[PDB]
Amino acid sequence: GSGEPREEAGALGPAWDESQLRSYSFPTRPIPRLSQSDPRAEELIENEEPVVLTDTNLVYPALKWDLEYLQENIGNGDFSVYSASTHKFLYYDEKKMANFQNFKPRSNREEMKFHEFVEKLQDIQQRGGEERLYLQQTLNDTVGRKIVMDFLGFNWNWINKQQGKRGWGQLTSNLLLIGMEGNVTPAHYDEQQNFFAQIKGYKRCILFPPDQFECLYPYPVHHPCDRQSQVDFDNPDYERFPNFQNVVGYETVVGPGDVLYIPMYWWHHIESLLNGGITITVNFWYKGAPTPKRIEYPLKAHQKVAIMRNIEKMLGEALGNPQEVGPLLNTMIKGRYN
Amino acid sequence: GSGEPREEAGALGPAWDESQLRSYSFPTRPIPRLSQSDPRAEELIENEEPVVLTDTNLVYPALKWDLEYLQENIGNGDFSVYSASTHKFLYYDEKKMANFQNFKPRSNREEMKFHEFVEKLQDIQQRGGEERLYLQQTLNDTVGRKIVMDFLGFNWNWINKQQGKRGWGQLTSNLLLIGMEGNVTPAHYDEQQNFFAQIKGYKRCILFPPDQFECLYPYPVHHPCDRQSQVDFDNPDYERFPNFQNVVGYETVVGPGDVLYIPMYWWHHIESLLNGGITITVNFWYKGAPTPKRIEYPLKAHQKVAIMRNIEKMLGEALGNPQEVGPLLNTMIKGRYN
Numbered sequence A, B: 001g002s003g004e005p006r007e008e009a010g011a012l013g014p015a016w017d018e019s020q021l022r023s024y025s026f027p028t029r030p031i032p033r034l035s036q037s038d039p040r041a042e043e044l045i046e047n048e049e050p051v052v053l054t055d056t057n058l059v060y061p062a063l064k065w066d067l068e069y070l071q072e073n074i075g076n077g078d079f080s081v082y083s084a085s086t087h088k089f090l091y092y093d094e095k096k097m098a099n100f101q102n103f104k105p106r107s108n109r110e111e112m113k114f115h116e117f118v119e120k121l122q123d124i125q126q127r128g129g130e131e132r133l134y135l136q137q138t139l140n141d142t143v144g145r146k147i148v149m150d151f152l153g154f155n156w157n158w159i160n161k162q163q164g165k166r167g168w169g170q171l172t173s174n175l176l177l178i179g180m181e182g183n184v185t186p187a188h189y190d191e192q193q194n195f196f197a198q199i200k201g202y203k204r205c206i207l208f209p210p211d212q213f214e215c216l217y218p219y220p221v222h223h224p225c226d227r228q229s230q231v232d233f234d235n236p237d238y239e240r241f242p243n244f245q246n247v248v249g250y251e252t253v254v255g256p257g258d259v260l261y262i263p264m265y266w267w268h269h270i271e272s273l274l275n276g277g278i279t280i281t282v283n284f285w286y287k288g289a290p291t292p293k294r295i296e297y298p299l300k301a302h303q304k305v306a307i308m309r310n311i312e313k314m315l316g317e318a319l320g321n322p323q324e325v326g327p328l329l330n331t332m333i334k335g336r337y338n
């Protein structure tokens, strides 16, 4: 999967061991770890394939970040902090909750100050509780001068050259992620290009190419969990999701200084290693390049994914009610295309 | 189904008996036979429900038509004549035959003069052959003066008032249908409003409302047999088409002078009665009224049918190949909406 664990400099031991990885039913192949100066890494990014770049220095000034330094300097703004009773955080589109009245939400959001999230995490650790927290906040203007200086110290030269070379849209946001050990963001896909810059701790990243759509069974587009896989990776229901027995992933473990390119529409399952301490990540999201004027066949897998999304959307509007999308689609194919 | 057979005037016996009707697996209810002056008949047509009008005099001058009079006066143009080895005529869109290379056609068209079709039918009857023929030709300018006079004698006053009252488009064509006894046009639906004017002989008409789409399993839109039911009414495959066990039809027998309104998108199965002689029919097709500017919910069944047709069409163009429509639709719903 992730290969034999890397050895940290200065003979400080292995960065992790296989007992910090969760157990799943599918095989994986390693994502390549390359230098940013390696043309193989440019070839991968251009072909919209994942790659771990080891030496971008993208967030070099942020490698000194921890909770004390952040609490001291990140400012007095509000931070979105997500809770969870188990290791799996259950995200959902709150705007789409109206369409599914029989939807029980289980990972609630709560805005708080940074110093509150820090002492709330210290609250849990000593009381021995099993509640998990996950801070996920877009970096804004309300951060202190020191964080602004660190932010200005990012390798904007390298990443801006990446944005122009690939024809991507401009940077949409930076997401700061601080998570507890063992936290799991379940498999889902995003519609923007992602540079996943690891800062503190180690995160296991399992990626699935867009052509695995058939094996990962995303929720209906109108469901609050749109773009998330319905499959419970810890207890896969092979009767509902038989092609999950065919899924093959791409796996890597990113540590401080690593930058993982997650191509747009690629599924990713992200977990903070067991017993590995808190994790810190900053993401760089770019809107993908505009679709070519004339079409090249055969279509890319992510184009077919977008086609399916648009059919579901347009059908929900045409029928007036997203709940009728399913029965019409079954009416369309039953005994005609299946 | 069609009720007890009507008694012809002058004590000339029953117009038909139940032994001239084919045997099928589904129940039926009678289509109402009404006077054109009956408001119930106007209510049915306005609600796009079938009705048999008994006294339109729509094609009154044509009631004297037979093969001798037609051969004498219909002119020297070409007439499309369809052949068939069995009673079921297998029509298909020749333009869509490219998409389905593994399609074997079994009811071939052949253009000929009217006098040839007449003596070819006399050829078959005396040689005892089992080959069937079905003349289906749009009436054009190349018809003799006498047929023009008969055509001018149609009740244009009544039918034009119908066209304006319902907001329909203008008349698209008149189809002259001359068929042999026992001929069957299998179940299919049309996208225009139809006034089905019976002239000679009797035809059993079995209609299914558009909301029976699920029970009648039409071919893929890109298939040459688009808009036709895949179900063999003489040997229904309940394993492929389980909801055909739920279908209920509307049934009637039309004779000379009867006009059957077949509403747009209504399925119809039309058969010339066994041992009943040749049949003559003229159809009047009108494009339906333009769809209302703002939408009224819930949708009509035929609107959902049109929605499904457009998804299949647009998907075939987007993917570049109609053969990929099926697998993408299954990919879309398998384990997500089913």
Ligand SMILES: O=C(O)Cc1cs/c(=N\C(=O)[C@@H]2CCN(S(=O)(=O)c3ccccc3)C2)n1O
Residues within 6 Å of the ligand: A136, A172, A173, A175, A177, A184, A185, A190, A191, A192, A193, A268, A270, A281, A285
């Ligand atoms: O725990 C982890 O490390 C894994 C993890 C935490 S958050 C996350 N992803 C996201 O938060 C967004 C939500 C929607 N998309 S988006 O449409 O591309 C977009 C991008 C920019 C602005 C708005 C929308 C990705 N991942 O994968």
Ligand SMILES: O=C(O)Cc1cs/c(=N\C(=O)[C@@H]2CCN(S(=O)(=O)c3ccccc3)C2)n1O
Residues within 6 Å of the ligand: B136, B172, B173, B175, B177, B184, B185, B190, B191, B192, B193, B268, B270, B281, B285
């Ligand atoms: O044997 C019988 O009596 C039954 C029978 C014989 S032919 C027939 N139907 C048709 O020939 C057309 C083919 C396509 N449509 S259409 O889109 O509405 C249309 C209408 C006008 C111009 C062009 C297209 C109906 N039926 O039902």
Ligand SMILES: [Zn+2]
Residues within 6 Å of the ligand: A188, A189, A190, A268
């Ligand atoms: Zn994501």
Ligand SMILES: [Zn+2]
Residues within 6 Å of the ligand: B188, B189, B190, B268
């Ligand atoms: Zn028809």
